[PDB]
Design a binder for this molecule. Sequence first.
Ligand SMILES: *[C@@H]1O[C@H](CO)[C@@H](O)[C@H](O)[C@H]1NC(C)=O
Lengths: 101, 51
Amino acid sequence: QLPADTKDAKPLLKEMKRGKEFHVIFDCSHEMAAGILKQALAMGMMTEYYHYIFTTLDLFALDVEPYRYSGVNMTGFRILNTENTQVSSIIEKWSMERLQA
Amino acid sequence: QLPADTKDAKPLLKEMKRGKEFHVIFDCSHEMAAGILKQALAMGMMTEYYH
Ligand SMILES: *[C@@H]1O[C@H](CO)[C@@H](O)[C@H](O)[C@H]1NC(C)=O
């Protein structure tokens, strides 16, 4: 269980490092998933060894640019059918309609 | 050698990962030192294995 006081998984992540649990399922929200990923990066928990799965259905929203070259074989799940052209067009319509982000 | 005309050592670090070189002795000004360390962190080449 991630600490409920704040999204600072420093002790829990260090415990995983001590336990050497490589394959690590998650069950989070993409907002908290981003923080967990960033804190994992600061511990070197994001290399060619670890292998995650995010139950979050918003994995594609993650800014994976700082992690794309890391070599982690991350996984996830996407239900938003963004591959379709109509869905994609509605996506840009949403992006332009959202004046404040 | 860190490529000249730029500071993006990305291919060098990737080759190091292919080369499995776990020990490194950099030699550069502190600005280039910070740059190369950040780029190494990008590839995740910065864990307790390396030195
Ligand atoms: C790539 O993913 C496989 C599982 O499909 C995993 O066993 C392997 O360690 C991964 N390679 C990495 C993370 O470099």
